[PDB]
Design an enzyme around this catalytic site. Structure first.
Site, PDB file in Angstrom:
ATOM      1  N   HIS A 197       0.803  -1.216   0.000  1.00 40.50           N
ATOM      2  CA  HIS A 197       0.000   0.000   0.000  1.00 40.50           C
ATOM      3  C   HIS A 197       0.837   1.269   0.000  1.00 40.50           C
ATOM      4  O   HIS A 197       0.298   2.343  -0.283  1.00 40.50           O
ATOM      5  CB  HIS A 197      -0.951   0.032   1.194  1.00 40.50           C
ATOM      6  CG  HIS A 197      -1.792   1.267   1.249  1.00 40.50           C
ATOM      7  ND1 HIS A 197      -1.726   2.169   2.288  1.00 40.50           N
ATOM      8  CD2 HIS A 197      -2.687   1.773   0.368  1.00 40.50           C
ATOM      9  CE1 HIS A 197      -2.560   3.167   2.056  1.00 40.50           C
ATOM     10  NE2 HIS A 197      -3.155   2.951   0.899  1.00 40.50           N
ATOM     11  N   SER A 252       0.383   0.128  -7.137  1.00 47.39           N
ATOM     12  CA  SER A 252       0.779  -0.989  -7.979  1.00 47.39           C
ATOM     13  C   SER A 252       1.281  -0.458  -9.311  1.00 47.39           C
ATOM     14  O   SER A 252       0.861   0.605  -9.773  1.00 47.39           O
ATOM     15  CB  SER A 252      -0.380  -1.961  -8.197  1.00 47.39           C
ATOM     16  OG  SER A 252      -0.637  -2.710  -7.025  1.00 47.39           O
ATOM     17  N   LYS A 295     -13.743  -7.039 -11.750  1.00 57.99           N
ATOM     18  CA  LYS A 295     -12.618  -7.658 -12.434  1.00 57.99           C
ATOM     19  C   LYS A 295     -12.065  -8.818 -11.626  1.00 57.99           C
ATOM     20  O   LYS A 295     -11.535  -9.775 -12.196  1.00 57.99           O
ATOM     21  CB  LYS A 295     -11.523  -6.631 -12.707  1.00 57.99           C
ATOM     22  CG  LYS A 295     -11.766  -5.780 -13.937  1.00 57.99           C
ATOM     23  CD  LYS A 295     -10.514  -5.017 -14.334  1.00 57.99           C
ATOM     24  CE  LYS A 295      -9.697  -5.766 -15.368  1.00 57.99           C
ATOM     25  NZ  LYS A 295     -10.249  -5.608 -16.737  1.00 57.99           N
ATOM     26  N   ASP A 296     -12.176  -8.753 -10.302  1.00 60.56           N
ATOM     27  CA  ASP A 296     -11.815  -9.910  -9.493  1.00 60.56           C
ATOM     28  C   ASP A 296     -12.894 -10.984  -9.553  1.00 60.56           C
ATOM     29  O   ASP A 296     -12.585 -12.181  -9.549  1.00 60.56           O
ATOM     30  CB  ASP A 296     -11.573  -9.484  -8.046  1.00 60.56           C
ATOM     31  CG  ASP A 296     -10.698  -8.252  -7.939  1.00 60.56           C
ATOM     32  OD1 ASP A 296      -9.735  -8.134  -8.726  1.00 60.56           O
ATOM     33  OD2 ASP A 296     -10.973  -7.398  -7.070  1.00 60.56           O
ATOM     34  N   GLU A 299       5.508 -33.774  -6.650  1.00 60.62           N
ATOM     35  CA  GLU A 299       4.366 -33.253  -7.379  1.00 60.62           C
ATOM     36  C   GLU A 299       4.818 -32.152  -8.329  1.00 60.62           C
ATOM     37  O   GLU A 299       5.888 -31.560  -8.167  1.00 60.62           O
ATOM     38  CB  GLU A 299       3.297 -32.743  -6.418  1.00 60.62           C
ATOM     39  CG  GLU A 299       2.412 -33.828  -5.774  1.00 60.62           C
ATOM     40  CD  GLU A 299       1.701 -34.772  -6.753  1.00 60.62           C
ATOM     41  OE1 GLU A 299       0.837 -35.544  -6.285  1.00 60.62           O
ATOM     42  OE2 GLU A 299       1.949 -34.734  -7.975  1.00 60.62           O
TER      43      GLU A 299
END
Ligand code: CDL
Ligand code: CDL
Ligand code: PEF
Ligand code: PEF
Ligand code: PEF
Ligand code: PEF
Ligand code: HEM
Ligand code: HEM
Ligand code: HEM
Ligand code: HEM
Ligand code: UQ6
Lengths: 126, 93, 248, 385, 57, 385, 93
Positions: free
Chosen positions: F202, F206, F228-229, F272
């Site tokens: 924060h 971004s 959008k999420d 894996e």
């Protein structure tokens, strides 16, 4: 939280009656003596809490000298309680000088706040 | 950060308390003070005066409840002592 | 809450292992186990203690084995899958004599025989209480009291009815020397033993506690001093008020 | 600008630990609360180290505890420390609440703090009950059955919800597995609530014992108060060591050390020392619905203590009658616990019922009338005409 | 002889920490052995050490 | 003033979900990061409801998994969702990494963020291995043996530390008990680290996809990017459903469903899919200590990426050679994983060695020289004399 | 509140970006226009333009590593195919 309008009304009613006054003045004096705050150096016009906004308006109305004196008394009380002692028996707040200096500045603003909270809910009338 | 609500205490420099003038705090520094200036006089005298000034406030409730508890206990074991037919049945039953 | 249902309150005996700085008298655990194995026999369980912790506390190294090869433990099968019994080793528990649970309720003529491995840590009071149970039986049953058949009286058991008799007689153990024929002796040995088996950590616990209490006491006093020290920079400041000039 | 206020990860710790203007006249009870938090963290740490060596079945749960207490290097210290640290945690929890009641902290500025605290209280009680069920002793299993059957009082949904939470008709594998998983999970939620408690606290700081504004002078946490918390926690650590080594089984009962047996019950079923007050009032009022509702009422009353007291002067240092009633209240609480621990007999029922009445009355009616008397006496005594 | 020599000995923080750690080490060792000795000789005939000697014949 | 920005418990959430001026030109990768967060939270929730019905002993750990498979109502969904959500979480985390590396979010003003993140990365790898041990199938036991024995490469004293972490001289009750307890502990520490991750994020918003200043214009958080999420999380839910119902046993390997047997091991033992890339470089170089150090050295050479990318122009949206090399590097990474999966024979040792060489080379020397060439070309193209 | 370090992005109003004048924005509100404009034309045309623009950056690395993988697989197959006595030994060492 409890307004001083009701307190003032109850107090005037008690004091006006002579027999009830003779009954309750001595116990009041002995109570405030045993209250345990005169000795450590407090006037009762400071013990009232300072969270309500009406209290903020009350303090903001005080003159300079009383506010400075109140600051000195409260910080000295802080320190003396920190020490665990009490003040010497020379600056104990004498009974005859526990004058109310702050009560009118509570009531003057409490009346305005009450009538503000009332006048909003007025009716159309006739 | 987003602006926050009004608060009655802030950070250093904006405490927000009433402005004071004429107060003059002093100090002595801890190194040149001999910490235990009063260690026996202060201890005994202040401890005893403080115990005296706030003595009743615990003596009265504790004594009241001790008397109550003693009476309750004594009545309880009086119940279960050669009295289960005459005293027990008149209150329990 | 009558006296009959609650039993006599436990006395205050003068123990030998009590006290903040006292270990066990485990010159007698060596015989407490002996008497326990003789007299308890196939009645109580003690199925929570491993023969790798009676070594160096009551028995030196090899006697524990020399009795461990006297039991069986049913370990893994052979090449044909038939389960096989082999002599016991040093890291296997004592077998509770009654196989699973049912033979117990078939032989005691009553309720389950409580597990001794933690009994004296799991009764009110308890350090004396087991002693009181073991020695509290009157030599003659009390007069004018109803009692179900089989069970024997107890002035210490809450409710006054115990399912087990009192096999604590005289001249029936003979540890190694002149000492038995005093039922108090066998009671003392068994109670010390059970107080040990409830927690095979008494000695070490007491030592660590002593070390910790000494260290903490010293640290606490030092902290008192340091608090008196660096707080003294404000526990003595003095304020002097001055009436400010009245001008505005 | 100093690095102490630049890096965010350290700016936060600065604002809460390195520099925070605590008030000058603070007594030892704020340090009592900090000691409480540190007790929580040591409890969590030793709990994790406990759980790394704990099974979770029902035929293999008692064996696990005997194993951890007897057959692991330096183990019994862990188990006694967890138990007696929990007991001391409840001691200090009650002490922190009593301080809050006494000194006027529950008043208007920090109602949110008070609410979050009582939420933490009910959470903590739940956690302690869960863990006390995790042992699956003799009386612990009965306690689990009783509490999981408490919810059957609710009308209509009285048998479906218990059949859900209980996960079966009887206490068995799913019950204990569920209880252990919850007992592990919920302390982390407590930690989150502790963070919330701190945030709601720092917005307005702590309160003076004198009940006076603390906006006049202040001194920082570190290098003044960190040492005070250090000395009080040294005292706590030494007393806890005294218990965990010298006399381990004094803050509990010798019934948890018994294999679970849903065939017989002990002579007296009692909770641990920190629940007897909230157990006497159950035997008090002989209506199942009334008891189930009155427990949560005994908590909701702590919730409703704000905007009930109406003395304009905060705290009870300067109100002789109010503080005397507070002391009779605290002795009421201890008497309530004690009367619960003793059996239900002829005088005890009257004792407990009167105790509940005076307790709830002190919360509800004693405080306001006494407060008004105090305010009017103060107003009339100092004025003449 | 608390002259300036000890103040100069305490002036360097790193040597202060080194000295406090060395003192912790030696204190741990000697304190542990002393406590064990006191606890041991305080019980003659109790601890296994002398019991095994007595049973030896 | 609006109640959303006044109450502290809500003034916090306002600045992170309700009002956070994200940049205008966002694409789906930061929405993918939000997807990752929701994958973490659903993993935690289903893990709680998993451990609610999971035992811990070595003899009763496999039986516990079959019990959660069938004998619990609507439970197989829980187990498959746990496993496949974990695998999808790792894939989406890898894609989060690759995004971050491509777009140049690792530029200097977010180095703390990037370091914290790679700490989450190493922690999460540890958690995955811990849980895979918690299953204790057949090859998970050997994997635990090898990875515990990894620390024996430490000079001088190496046997004591491994024997300590390995609970004795054999894989037994303390081993799996401690592994499961730590697995159940660690994701909360991950949660703490990711709340720190958000805190560090924060401070400076971004990054733009264009690798340019985004302080010019921004659009509010809620009512724009929440959807959008939502779209991407719905895609995740449907693809996870497709993999959890119709095609369950594809991402994992069909070997875990075997009882543990420390006597026979199959010739085909592989981790894996999301641990193949590091396993390849481990088996590549022909040494024990070299491989053990070079794994954590791969993590550290990830770390060293900042103050090495010496392009004055941020990101790889306008550098043909740099983005081509990044694509050669990601295809390198997938090739590395796949060759690790395949058996080692004559034509593979050289292949793997060259792969590791080009991998570490891209981290160390490819970025600086290529970046400098790009910068000097950019200067020379648009200058006269 | 406690002042913190310098930050490259402020909040609304003090956002910190360069001050600008003369820039004009617009909007038409979501409800006054069709949500799906272009839907297909932009879909196909822009999809093909984008796929054309960056085709080689994903084509070339994939081709290179596919060539490696195919060569490795074929050589491994040839190794263990009637060649374990005349080729496997001379290259295994
Ligand atoms: C013990 C049981 C009670 C414990 C209650 C909790 C006490 C606590 O939290 O600490 C307060 C603690 C310090 O008080 P403070 O808050 O710093 O100052 C406020 C004073 O009360 C202000 O009042 P005061 O000081 O006038 O009277 C209190 C008096 C009370 O002190 C007494 O004399 C105790 C007896 C009267 C009080 C009885 C209990 C109440 O305190 C003192 O005398 C000060 C401490 C004296 C000890 C100084 C030690 C110097 C360092 C020694 C190093 C030795 C190293 C050895 C090797 C290692 O008070 C004590 O003195 C109690 C601890 C001492 C117990 C010794 C046994
Ligand atoms: C079982 C589980 C136990 C778990 C314990 C956990 C740690 C407990 C720590 C207790 C603690 O912090 O005590 C505070 C601390 C309270 O003293 P302070 O820090 O000066 O605070 C003033 C009080 O609020 C009171 O203000 P004041 O100046 O009016 O003091 C009157 C004094 C009345 O006591 C005396 O007059 C001293 C003589 C007592 C013997 O009242 C007490 O504080 C007595 C409480 C302790 C007895 O304890 C003391 O009384 C210090 C020793 C003097
Ligand atoms: C094992 C049983 C122990 C019982 C005693 C417990 C401790 C109680 C100590 C009380 C001391 C007497 C009260 C003060 C008397 C006094 O002040 O006498 C003089 C001195 C201290 O004078 P001062 O510096 O405090 O004067 C300060 C003002 N100028 O006193 C002592 O140094 C007593 C030392 C022996 C103890
Ligand atoms: C220190 C606490 C001791 C707790 C304890 O001792 O718990 C046991 C006693 C029971 O008393 P008891 O005689 O029945 O114990 C008989 C068995 N030996 O509970 C109490 O007194 C509780 C009294 C206070 C409870 C509320 C306290 C809240 C503050
Ligand atoms: C995830 C994709 C599905 C995995 C899969 O489908 O399978 C697992 C494959 C290998 O499986 P395999 O090719 O060895 O065939 C054996 C199974 N039938 O993982 C890979 O090496 C490709 C991805 C690993 C390297 C890229 C990491 C990306 C981040
Ligand atoms: C199952 C197999 C399906 C195969 C086809 C998959 C979908 C491919 C769609 C390609 C459509 C043809 C090219 C665009 C033509 C076009 O744009 O025609 C015009 C419309 C939309 O144009 P517009 O109004 O958005 O332009 C906006 C500005 N004038 O198009 C369609 O309504 C195609 C309907 C059929 C589907
Ligand atoms: C995990 C448990 C808790 C922790 C860690 C905690 C933490 C703290 C801390 C650090 C403080 C500041 C000073 C101090 O330490 O006391 C504080 C103060 C306070 N806490 Fe708590 N607390 C807890 C539980 C509670 C509960 C249950 C309540 C109320 C029901 C509560 C109410 C308060 C109050 C009223 C203050 C007032 C401080 C002031 O008036 O000066 N707390 N708490
Ligand atoms: C979160 C980590 C924790 C773990 C892993 C944990 C684990 C355990 C375990 C294994 C037991 C004993 C189980 C049994 O006896 O069968 C136990 C008991 C207990 N725990 Fe916890 N615990 C944790 C946190 C807490 C907390 C935060 C509290 C309260 C503050 C608490 C209070 C108790 C109590 C009171 C007991 C008593 C029962 C007994 O003595 O064992 N625990 N815990
Ligand atoms: C549980 C783990 C993680 C969570 C919940 C998380 C969450 C987030 C969130 C919410 C953002 C804001 C944009 C977005 O949603 O993508 C973000 C951005 C970012 N994360 Fe993470 N993250 C995690 C792990 C990591 C790791 C492990 C790294 C790197 C090692 C990392 C590096 C980044 C970077 C570089 C950004 C930059 C955004 C920008 O430049 O535009 N994250 N993360
Ligand atoms: C993002 C974090 C986590 C990841 C990536 C993760 C991953 C895994 C994986 C891969 C397995 C192996 C299961 C399989 O083979 O099918 C597993 C097992 C398990 N995990 Fe987790 N896990 C995480 C967090 C948690 C949490 C928080 C819990 C508990 C609250 C938990 C509880 C379990 C349990 C009980 C198993 C049992 C093994 C099984 O039944 O197959 N996990 N986890
Ligand atoms: C039989 O004799 C008795 C007896 O009479 C009494 C009264 C008691 C006393 C017992 C009680 C008073 C019981 C009190 C216990 C509880 C109220 C605990 C009940 C259990 C819970 C509340 C479970 C809580 C678990 C959770 C997971 C809470 C859910 C969490 C939520 C909703 C938060 C979600 C998280 C986020 C971030 C949204 C006894 O112990 C006892 O035995 C001796």
């Amino acid at each position: 939280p409890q307004s001083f309008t009701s307190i003032a009304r109850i107090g005037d009613y008690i004091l006006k009656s002579p027999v009830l006054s003779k009954l309750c003045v001595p116990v009041a004096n002995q109570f405030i003596n045993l209250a345990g705050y005169k000795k450590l150096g407090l006037k009762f016009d400071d013990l009232i809490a300072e969270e309500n906004p009406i209290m903020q308006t009350a303090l903001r109305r005080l003159p300079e000298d009383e506010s400075y004196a109140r600051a000195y008394r409260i910080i000295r009380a802080h320190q003396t309680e920190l020490t665990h002692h009490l003040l010497p028996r020379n600056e104990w707040i004498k009974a005859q000088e526990d004058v109310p200096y702050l009560l009118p500045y509570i009531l003057e603003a409490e009346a305005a706040a009450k009538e503000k909270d009332e006048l909003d809910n007025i009716e159309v009338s006739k | 950060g987003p602006p926050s609500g009004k608060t009655y205490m802030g950070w250093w420099g904006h405490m927000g308390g009433p402005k004071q003038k004429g107060i003059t705090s002093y100090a002595v520094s801890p190194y040149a003070q001999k910490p235990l200036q009063g260690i026996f006089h202060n201890a005994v005298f202040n401890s005893f005066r403080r115990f005296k000034s706030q003595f009743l406030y615990v003596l009265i409730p504790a004594g009241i409840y001790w008397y109550w508890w003693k009476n309750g206990n004594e009545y309880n074991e009086f119940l279960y002592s050669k009295a289960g037919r005459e005293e027990l049945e008149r209150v329990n039953v | 809450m009558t006296a009959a249902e609650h039993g006599l309150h436990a006395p205050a005996y003068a123990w030998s292992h009590n006290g903040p700085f006292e270990t066990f008298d485990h010159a007698s655990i060596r015989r407490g186990y002996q008497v326990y194995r003789e007299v308890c026999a196939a009645c109580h369980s003690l199925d929570r203690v491993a023969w790798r912790t009676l070594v160096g506390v009551s028995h030196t190294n090899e006697e524990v084995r020399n009795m461990a090869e006297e039991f069986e433990y049913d370990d893994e099968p052979d090449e044909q899958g038939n389960p096989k019994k082999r002599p016991g080793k040093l890291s296997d528990y004592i077998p509770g004599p009654y196989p699973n649970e049912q033979a117990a309720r078939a032989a005691n003529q009553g309720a389950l025989p409580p597990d001794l491995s933690l009994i004296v840590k799991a009764r009110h009071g308890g350090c004396d209480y087991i002693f009181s149970l073991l020695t509290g039986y009157p030599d003659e049953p009390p007069a004018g009291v109803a009692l179900p058949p089989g069970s024997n009286y107890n002035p210490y058991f809450p409710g006054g009815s115990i399912a087990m008799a009192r096999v604590l007689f005289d001249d029936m153990v003979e540890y190694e020397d002149g000492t038995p024929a005093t039922t108090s002796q066998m009671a003392k040995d068994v109670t010390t033993f059970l107080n040990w088996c409830a927690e095979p950590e008494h000695d070490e616990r007491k030592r660590l506690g002593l070390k910790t209490v000494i260290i903490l006491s010293s640290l606490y006093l030092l902290s008192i001093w340091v608090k008196k020290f660096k707080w003294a920079g404000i526990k003595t400041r003095k304020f002097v008020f001055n009436p400010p000039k009245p001008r505005k | 600008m100093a690095f102490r206020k630049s890096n965010v990860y350290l700016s936060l710790v600065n604002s809460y630990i390195i520099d925070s203007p605590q008030p000058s006249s603070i007594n030892y009870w704020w340090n009592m609360g900090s000691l409480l938090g540190l007790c929580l963290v040591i409890q969590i740490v030793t709990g994790i180290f406990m759980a790394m060596h704990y099974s979770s079945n029902i035929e293999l749960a008692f064996s696990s505890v005997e194993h951890i207490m007897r057959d692991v290097h330096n183990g019994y210290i862990l188990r006694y420390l967890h138990a007696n640290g929990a007991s001391f945690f409840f001691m200090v929890m009650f002490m922190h609440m009593a301080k809050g009641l006494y000194y006027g902290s529950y008043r208007s500025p920090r109602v949110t703090l008070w609410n979050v605290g009582v939420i933490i209280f009910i959470l903590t009680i739940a956690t302690a009950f869960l863990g006390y069920c995790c042992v699956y002793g003799q009386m612990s299993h009965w306690g689990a059955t009783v509490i999981t059957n408490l919810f059957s009082a609710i009308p209509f949904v009285g048998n479906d919800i218990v059949s859900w939470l209980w996960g079966g008709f009887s206490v068995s594998n799913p019950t204990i597995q569920r209880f252990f998983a919850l007992h592990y999970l919920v302390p982390f939620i407590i930690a989150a609530m502790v963070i919330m408690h701190l945030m709601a606290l720092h917005i307005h700081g702590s309160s003076n014992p004198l009940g006076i504004t603390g906006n006049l002078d202040r001194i920082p946490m570190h290098s003044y108060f960190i040492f005070k918390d250090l000395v009080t926690v040294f005292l706590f650590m030494l007393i806890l060591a005294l218990f965990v080594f010298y006399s381990p089984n004094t803050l509990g009962h010798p019934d948890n050390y018994i294999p679970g047996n849903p065939l017989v019950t002990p002579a007296s079923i009692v909770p641990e020392w920190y629940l007897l007050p909230f157990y006497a009032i159950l035997r008090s009022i002989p209506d199942k619905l009334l008891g189930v509702i009155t427990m949560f009422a005994a908590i909701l009353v702590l919730l409703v203590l704000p905007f009930t007291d109406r003395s304009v002067v905060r705290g009870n240092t300067f109100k002789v009658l109010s503080k005397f009633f507070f002391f009779i209240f605290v002795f009421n609480f201890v008497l309530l616990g004690q009367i619960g621990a003793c059996h239900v007999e002829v005088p005890y029922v009257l004792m407990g019922q009167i105790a509940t009445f005076i307790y709830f009355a002190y919360f509800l009616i004693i405080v306001p009338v006494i407060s008004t008397i105090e305010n009017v006496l103060f107003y009339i005594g100092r004025v003449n005409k | 002889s608390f002259s300036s020599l000890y103040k100069t000995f305490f002036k360097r923080n790193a040597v202060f920490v080194g000295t406090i750690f060395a003192g912790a080490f030696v204190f741990q060792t000697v304190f542990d052995t002393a406590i064990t000795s006191w606890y041991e000789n305080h019980n003659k005939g109790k601890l296994w050490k002398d019991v095994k000697a007595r049973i030896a014949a």
